[PDB]
Amino acid sequence: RVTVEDCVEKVPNRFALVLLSAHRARGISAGAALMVDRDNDKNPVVALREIADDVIDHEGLKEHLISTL
Amino acid sequence: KVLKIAKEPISLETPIGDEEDSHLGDFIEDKNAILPIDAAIQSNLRETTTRVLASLTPREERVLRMRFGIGMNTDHTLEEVGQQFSVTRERIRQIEAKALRKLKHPSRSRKLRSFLD
Amino acid sequence: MDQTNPLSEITHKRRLSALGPGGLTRERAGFEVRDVHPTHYGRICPIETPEG
Amino acid sequence: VDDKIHARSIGPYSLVTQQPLGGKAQFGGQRFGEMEVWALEAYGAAYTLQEMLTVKSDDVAGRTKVYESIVRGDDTFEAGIPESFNVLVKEMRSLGLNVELEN
Amino acid sequence: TFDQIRISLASPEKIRSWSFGEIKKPETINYRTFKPERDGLFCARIFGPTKDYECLCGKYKRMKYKGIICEKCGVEVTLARVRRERMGHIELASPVAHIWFLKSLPSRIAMMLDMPLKDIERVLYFEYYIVTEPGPLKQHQLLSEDDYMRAQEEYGDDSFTAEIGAEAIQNLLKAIDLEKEAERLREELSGTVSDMKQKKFSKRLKILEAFQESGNRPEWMVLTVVPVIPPELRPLVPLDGGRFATSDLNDLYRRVINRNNRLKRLIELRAPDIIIRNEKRMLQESVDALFDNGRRGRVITGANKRPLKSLADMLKGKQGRFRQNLLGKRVDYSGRSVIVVGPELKLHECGLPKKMALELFKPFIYARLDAKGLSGTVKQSKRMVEREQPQVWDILEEVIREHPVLLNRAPTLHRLGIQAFEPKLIEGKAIQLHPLVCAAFNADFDGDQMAVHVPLSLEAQLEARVLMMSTNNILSPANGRPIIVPSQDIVLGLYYLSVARDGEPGEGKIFADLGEIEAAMDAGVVSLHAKIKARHTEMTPEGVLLRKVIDTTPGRMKIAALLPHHPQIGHRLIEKALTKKEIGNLIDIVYRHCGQKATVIFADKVMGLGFKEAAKAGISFGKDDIIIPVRKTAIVEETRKLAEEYEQQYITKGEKYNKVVDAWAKATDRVADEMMAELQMKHKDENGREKEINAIYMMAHSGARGSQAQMKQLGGMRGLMAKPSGEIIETPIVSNFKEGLTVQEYFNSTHGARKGLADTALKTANSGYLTRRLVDVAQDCIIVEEDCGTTKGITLRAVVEGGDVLVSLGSRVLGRFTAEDVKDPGTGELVVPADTYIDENIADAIEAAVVQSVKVRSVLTCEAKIGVCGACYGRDLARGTPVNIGEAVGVIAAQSIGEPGTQLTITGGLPRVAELFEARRPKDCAVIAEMDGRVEFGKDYKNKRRIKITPDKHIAVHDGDYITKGEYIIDGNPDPHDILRILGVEALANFLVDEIQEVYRLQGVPINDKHIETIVRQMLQKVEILEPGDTGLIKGDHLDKPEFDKEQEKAIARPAVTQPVLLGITKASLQTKSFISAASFQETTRVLTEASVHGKTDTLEGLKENVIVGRLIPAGTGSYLRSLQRVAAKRDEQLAQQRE
DNA sequence: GCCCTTAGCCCCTTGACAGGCGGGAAACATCGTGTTAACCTTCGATTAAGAGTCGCTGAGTCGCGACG
DNA sequence: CGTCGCGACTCAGCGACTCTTAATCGAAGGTTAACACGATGTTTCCCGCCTGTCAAGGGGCTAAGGGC
Ligand SMILES: [Mg+2]
Ligand SMILES: [Zn+2]
Ligand SMILES: [Zn+2]
């Protein structure tokens, strides 16, 4: 339901908007998304909708997870 | 039995249509490749068994698992699983029968009633 | 045998296929034999032909 | 539309490559070809290509894993060596080549 | 894990280490019991058990034992997966020469010791004996008669020995050493002329350095032990009917085993020397056919008559790693259904049949039922969805809510062919596709099965929502034109809404709001002919604009209200007729100025608006729709009379051309022009109001489905039909499709149209081949660096023919970062900065003043070490935003170049593009001058003037005239190779770009220049090494070598210089660093040998490499994950440096 | 309200089968050998009606000079 | 003061990999010396060891009812 142009202004790469959004959705699977309501939406769509407030915070967690151990 | 003895195995690369595309090798099925669905029931049968065994006695659940093997694939017999717990006698068979008759009620054997098919 | 209807049987029976054993294959045809010669007039239809 | 419709999440797989069969014969799957994989290659959808031709079709050890993960609830997968690459390296190893992985 | 796959020669010891048991009998299974034999092509103890953890003879089939081996059968108990990985080996009684190295284009076995393949092939087949250890009896004398073998041996019976065959060639390869041979060839390559011997010496030195560097011994091309493919790869599954279906490789391996057993029995039996050598020759031929089967006599199977495929035949055709195995994987979780129009759906929502959504989302349905608690177990869930219970449909609509599905059309020519859609559980069994998006798919609804895919992963399900969504694929990757523009119906509706006529009810009746127009139209006071005044907000200046009472129309207001509120847009765009081109420019301007959300919402609204106003309009085609020109019979009679006046006296060809060109080819547009003029005139009824516009004329003018050529063919003169050779028909063809065509004219029509129809089916194959070549030459052209440190760029000049511009300079330069700041002519004012993005505003400012070519940074001038840069590719063609790192720029450009195919066209359009991309010498090879000023005469009596040096056939220059570099003697069709050898690389790139643009404009498919720029850059990845010292390679070489070799030579001193060489798209894989990328689409028997003997290791840097290997692609989301992996590795290294 | 007495359930000891994987012993269907000597001592297909190019070979034409 | 004795020379010539991209339905036809022990498996029951019933008996523990 949420477009990419509305949420790509914060992540002007269009690929970090995918990986970071997937990481945010996975975190929502264990409890996340305290910034925007779900509005009866799936995990990826809600992550893309709330990506306007976790542009840098999501990339750091993904980078830490990519690191071994 | 002499006839029908696989007189000539057809080439698996033979054409299937009017052209030489999509040979017979690309259309043969697999009777040994485990389908992902049948693996799903395997993983859930590993989950649905660990849950039903969590209600039994700890030592009794351990001896029942040793009778078949959930983590260890070495399927032990009655006496072999008997020595691991107590004196190897009919007591192990008795507790196994009691456990087997235990999870046969609609409460414990609820999700397994549609599992055996 | 294309037997979807009585016309398919007739058009399949009256089908001159330039491919098969003894003639050019589907690749062997080329842009030459895939044309219609002037002598084809009256003897072979130029419109009814497979699109593939 | 009946004779042409088709939908097979997981059907009978082949033998030479362990891939899902083609066509609507026996629960086939829409073959994802080189010219149709380039559509996702030019796209940024590399995770799809890392799961559509890696764990979806040609990973006998990864297909069941991804199916169990999807059934459990988590949309996570893993696929390192597809069966296509395995059969390719086995065929190349059949000749005088020394196709062998490392590090 | 694994990475950096490397190939080399398979050592006999390493081959034995790979195998698990030597097969000595050509027996697969038993005729009574279907079990593997002891030692054969299908073995249990050699390749593993046939059943999962079920040993042979029913002894360890309980799975309790995993490493225990049987006693009677000797097979170790293991799952059936090991039967596909376990290899085998056949220790041949005599060696055998590899078919890939013996018989091929480069004779890799003949390059050793400098012996031609014509004699190496004779010494291997035991025809001409070879001499070894000479000491009369010259080295490599190649003697066959027994005179010198026995009669000449009567010199004491000492020091006389020679061999023949595969063993002889193996001993010869063992005798030659790599280091000494390379050292001998080094001095033979330098300090000498090397006129003809250099061509072979270069290849020999390359092969020797590959063998020495890779560590492979020279005597490994001939193999004493042949490895066997595992039995699971070549299966023997019992087919339905008791007839086993054995693979092609099984028969070849059985033949090889039979030959080996026969040779072993002959050697142990002490057979005649002519039969053992003949047995070795038969075994060698069998091993040759088992590998390639093409270089030999094409040995056919004993049962079938089809040519048996081999280990090489599999990889070559589509049925191996090329198409069937690796690239074109038959992915599951997919669906193919006939598509139907989905106008009730949104642009980002495709219809999915309920009967297909269950089979597609079976695991997702199971997960939703398990999490929701509806189903206790997976088996119960499968039993629930299998019967299609009414409670699972509610879960299917809930699971398919934001899970996009990839819609894959049968033919794909660009990245928009795979677009993910939020599925809607529509009734029926057909994919309800959106009307606006099917144009980008190339899928009409006349029958087009759109294969639907479902991404399983959470990232793939999210990757299909950020990039593969239909809302994000508005602008096609070919150029800056939106591909979501209405094709046929919405464009017709908008044209009917925008057509304004001075005569209509409600003239100048001012309305209050937008709803007033519809309220008055429902009352019958105002018509839809767009001639009434009302109020509307245009929003031209900064901020909100007042509701100015515009003098516009009601029909253009219904479309104007759908336009988003933003400056530079409004009713000023709808003031035109709103044709297909104008409506595409409107969807482009709304996306160029406003965002993608508003653009997609306007596209969704206008489709519904155009649909609602097209059905209510009544655009049905009728007999009076196609109006034949009343001034047609007279012009036809006058033309046919003029065709007879000059025919009385008669040259016949001149009179014919006067009667076919000036008589029928001319005045056929006159009749068509008169028809168009009579069709454009709006007939006014007796009540002063025009009756209506012709529906066919509306379709032709709006651009939905009509055209001038189609109009003339339908109602005009129909033109003149073609011929098999291309000549125009001379007979009179005066009849339109509205009238009755007689038999002869219709036969000529179907004689001229079947040629184009075959071109749609034959030239499309050439289009597919060109697209395959481009994506595999441009796969490495991936944007990785955002901004490179380069300043030079290609010059982009607006192409012009005659006196007008063919393409606007503002459009050619739009979306490309400038190299140097463009200076406006006349006044020295910096209109554009040096290294900033060229936005649409910058392009408009540049086009506001007439300017010459502007220095533009392109992918050609990229100084990036790996991949392409971001400040050079410019703007991604997907949207108005600049290109981001990770996009497959090369793949996008290849798709954009292949999209104009199937409608192109010798040298007309498609063949010319294929010739220019492959860089072949045309039929008339042009020779560049390179001389300045005066030009002298060439040598005396050398059949041609090669070149004249003045340092200070057909000819087009004089002997004393002042010639300037650039003017080359040719009648046309220059050569790009000569252009690079004489002229610069940027000049060749500009020539190729202009040629491709001229071709695509003559055909009509506009393609962006950068899409050709990336292909031209990928064609320039090789550079001829002219280094006099430190490197003996003079032929072409990848640029990474001079990036590394030229840097290493400076740390030892001779200066190194290399001129860039241009190779065709097909020749890109010939010298590419990666072999999997080259062995994918190119010939698999030459690139593998070029990579096996060279020990080429695939670093998996490209896109096609990771696709075949299965790992994540280094482009796109995979590119970003690779960057994250690299930064994580750097962080781990920094952390390790902290703790010593 | 607490203590004594008796009944019911749980547990232990023996056991008379029942047959049941499995090697042995045996009766019977395979699988690789031989062996016989009356006459022919070159069998046979299969492209070859489009098309861009890689890898090699072998003919006719010239320079440099020596000996009359 | 010519040529030819003797050398390269590039020119021809000859071989040779692919046929987009998903799809419309599964299998697919021939070749026709005779016999003999032997060593080699194949297949049946038959007891050996052992596994699994339910029962019999009993006691020991637990608990419920009655009396002071
Ligand atoms: Mg269509
Ligand atoms: Zn066994
Ligand atoms: Zn660059």
Residues E1113, E790 contacting (CB under 8 angstroms): no
Please give the backbone phi and psi of residue E1128, each rounded to the nearest 5 degrees, phi first: -70, -40
Amino acid at E640: R
Residue indicated by tokens 């530079």: E568
CATH fourth-level superfamily of E630-755 = RNA polymerase Rpb1 funnel domain (1.10.132.30)
Of E724, E751, E761, the CB nearest to C52: E761
> Looking at chain B, which subunits does it touch, using at least 3 CB pairs closer than 8 Å as the criterion?
C, D, E
- Is the Cβ atom of E322 within 7 Å of strand G at any atom? yes
Method used for this model?
Answer: cryo-EM
Q: How far apart are CA E11 and CA E159, in angstroms?
A: 32
Distance E337 CA to ligand 1 centre (A): 13
Q: Taking Cα atoms as reference points, which of E131, E167, E128 lies closest to residue E263?
A: E167
Closest CA to E542 of E566, E570, E561: E566
DSSP state of E917: H
Q: How far is the CA of E965 from the centre of ligand 3 (A)?
A: 29
Q: Could you tell me the maximum CA-CA distance found in chain C, to the nearest angstrom?
A: 32
Rg, chain A, Cα only: 11
Backbone angles phi, psi at E599, to 5 degrees: -65, -45
Q: Checking phi first, is residue E140 left (phi over 0); if not, alpha (psi -120 to 50) or beta?
A: left
Residue E42: count of CB within 10 angstroms of its CB: 25
Spatial separation of the C-alpha atoms in residues E619 and E611, rounded to whole Å:
12
HSE-up of E578 (CA within 13 Å, CB side)? 29
Asked if E365 and E381 count as a contact pair (C-beta separation under 8 A), the reply is yes
- Rounded CA gap, E469 and E348, in Å? 7
Q: Using an 8 Å Cβ cutoff, are E244 and B9 in contact? A: yes
Strand boundaries in E1021-1129, DSSP class E: 1022-1025, 1058-1061, 1097-1098
C26 CB within 8 Å of a chain B CB? yes
Q: How far apart are CA D31 and CA E964, in angstroms?
A: 57
E448 labeled binding residue: yes
Cα dihedral sign, B15-B21-B25-B29: negative
C-alpha torsion sign, points E112, E115, E116, E120: negative
Contact of D61 with E203, CB cutoff 8 Å:
no
Token couple for E474:
């508005």
- Give chain A's end-to-end CA distance (angstroms, integer): 37
Are E771 and E898 in contact, with CB atoms under 8 Å apart?
Answer: yes
Resolution (A): 3.8
Cα(E888)–Cα(E782) distance, rounded to whole angstroms?
A: 5
| Whether the Cβ atoms of residue E387 and residue D37 lie closer than 8 Å to each other | no
To the nearest 10°, the Cα dihedral for E644, E650, E656, E660? -20
B94 is near strand F: CB distance < 7 Å: yes
Torsion of CA E396, E397, E399, E403, to 10 degrees: 120
Q: SS3 for E796?
A: strand
Nearest-ligand number for the alpha carbon of E1013: 3
CB of E1120 within 8 Å of a chain A CB? The answer is yes
Two tokens at E1134? 């920094």
Q: How far apart are CA E1026 and CA E1019, in angstroms?
A: 19
| Cα separation values, E1113 from E114, E887, E888, E1074, E1084, Å | 43, 11, 10, 15, 22
Q: Which residues are registered as beta bridge partners of E43?
A: E37
E43 known member of a binding site:
no
Q: Name residues whose C-beta falls within 8 Å of residue B12's C-beta, 6 or more positions apart in sequence.
A: B23, B24, B25, B28, D16, E234, E235, E245, E246, E247, E248, E250
> Which residue ranges make up each domain of chain A?
4-66
Tokens of E533: 């005044």
Other beta carbons within 10 angstroms of residue B32's beta carbon come to 16
Strands E87-97 and E19-22: parallel
The strand F neighbours among C residues 19-48, by Cβ under 7 Å, are: 23-24, 27-28, 30-33
Which uninterrupted H or E stretch holds E701?
helix E695-702
Give the bridge partners for E617, in sequence order: none
Between CA E599 and CA E607, with CA E604 as vertex, the angle to 5 degrees is: 120
Q: CA nearest B19 in C: which residue?
A: C26
Kindly give the pairing relationship between strand E351-353 and strand D31-32: unpaired
- Cα diameter, chain B: 72
Query: Where does residue E670 rank: exposed (0-12), middle (13-18), buried (19+ CB within 10 A)?
Result: middle
Q: What are the residues facing E823 on neighbouring strands?
A: E830
Cα E171 versus chain centre, distance: 45
Give the three-state DSSP class for D84: helix
CA–CA gap between residue E165 and residue E144 (Å, rounded): 12
B-C C-beta contacts closer than 8 Å:
3
Distance CA E1128, CA E526 (A): 68
Q: Is A13 exposed, middle or buried (0-12, 13-18, 19+ CB in 10 A)?
A: buried
Closest C-alpha to E92, from E220, E263, E217, E250: E263
Supply φ then ψ for residue E231, to 5 degrees: -70, -25
Please give residues of chain B from 55 to 84 whose alpha-adjacent beta carbon (CB) lies under 7 Å from any atom of strand G: 77-79
* φ and ψ of E854, to 5 deg: -105, 140
Query: Which amino acid appears at position E569 of this protein?
Result: I
Nucleic strand G contact set for D 18-47 (CB, < 7 Å): 22-26, 28-36
Contact A25 E462 (CB under 8 A): yes
What are chain E's partners, defined as 3 or more CB pairs within 8 angstroms?
Answer: A, B, C, D
| Cβ-based burial of E49 (10 A; exposed 0-12, middle 13-18, buried ≥19) | buried
Q: For residue C19, what are its two tokens?
A: 């491919």
**Residue E633: partners with Cβ closer than 8 Å, 6 or more residues away:** none
Task: Tell me which chain A residue has its CA closest to the CA of residue D48.
Answer: A18
Could you tell me the distance in Å between the CA of residue E219 and the C1' of nucleotide F38? 55
Q: How far, in Å, is the centroid of ligand 2 from the Cα of E60?
A: 6
What Å value separates CA E946 and C1' G1?
33
Cα-flanking dihedrals φ and ψ of residue E237, to 5°? -70, 140
Contact (CB, 8 A) for E926 and E798: no
**Residue owning tokens 């092939």:** E121
Whether the CB-CB separation of E1002 and E761 falls below 8 Å is answered with no
Chain G footprint bases within 7 A of protein beta carbons: 8-11, 15-31, 42, 50-54
E391 touches strand F (CB under 7 A): no
Q: Please, which residues have CB within 8 angstroms of residue E339's CB and are 6 or more apart in sequence? A: E430, E431, E432, E433, E438, E443, E445, E448, E449, E450
